[PDB]
Design a binder for this molecule. Structure first.
Ligand code: HEM
Ligand code: NA
Length: 207
């Protein structure tokens, strides 16, 4: 089933992602709110690009049940960032890192070419990752740095009653998505590429 193959084909990359210098330092309480904020600003840029690609691919009729609009993060993130930065000025001030530029370019390609299987891979990497682990990151931002949970709405999914039931449903949706052999190989390749993009974002953030 595709869910298991996605997990297994990216397991090594997931492990590298848990041990990136920036993300490891952040979660162990060795950085600070400033660094968490920089993370969230870059995330806002790529979630914005991701959600345009989602919208396009959903509109095309591909993977519609998987592409649940309750997952959308960009607007919630912007409200977090308003709280973290003290105003809405950051929107006009932030600049994409080179890795974020590259990720945003790929997401815009996926959007404009309506690359459904690519989009689903990036959807899995982002949303199932935040569904799974985002609770932990949020708890640690609060515990290590005193971030108010009002600035942690990104890690809370309001439209989702029960996360464990949700993740099971999501995996089952992956398992039922009708794909040609070539579309499936592309989806799996793209999931690897999504982690590499993520790894380069964290790399830039630690530099
Ligand atoms: C930032 C880059 C990360 C990405 C893109 C990401 C992505 C993912 C994905 C896609 C899954 C689902 C695996 C599956 O069941 O198919 C997952 C699970 C998980 N993630 Fe990550 N992850 C990242 C970082 C982290 C970090 C730093 C931690 C440690 C706090 C973490 C903790 C976990 C744990 C414990 C699970 C197991 C399932 C669960 O907790 O419900 N992740 N992640
Ligand atoms: Na291209």
């Amino acid at each position: 089933g595709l869910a298991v193959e996605l997990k297994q084909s990216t397991a090594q990359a997931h492990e590298k992602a848990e041990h990136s210098t920036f993300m490891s330092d952040l979660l162990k309480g060795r950085l600070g709110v400033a660094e968490f904020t920089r993370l969230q600003e870059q995330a806002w840029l790529f979630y914005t690009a991701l959600e345009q690609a989602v919208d396009a691919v959903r509109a095309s009729g591909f993977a519609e049940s998987l592409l649940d609009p309750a997952l959308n993060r960009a607007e919630v993130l912007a409200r977090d960032l308003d709280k973290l930065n003290g105003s809405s000025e950051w929107r006009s001030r932030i600049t994409a890192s080179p890795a974020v530029i590259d990720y945003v370019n790929r997401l815009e390609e996926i959007r404009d070419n309506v690359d459904g299987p690519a989009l689903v891979a990036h959807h899995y990497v982002r949303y199932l990752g935040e569904l799974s682990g985002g609770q932990v990151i949020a708890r640690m931002m609060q515990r290590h740095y005193g971030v108010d949970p009002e600035a942690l709405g990104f890690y809370h999914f309001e439209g989702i009653a029960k996360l464990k039931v949700y993740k099971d449903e999501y995996r089952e949706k992956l398992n039922n998505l009708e794909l040609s052999d070539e579309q499936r190989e592309h989806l799996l390749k793209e999931a690897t590429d999504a982690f590499v993009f993520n790894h380069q974002v964290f790399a830039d953030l630690g530099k």
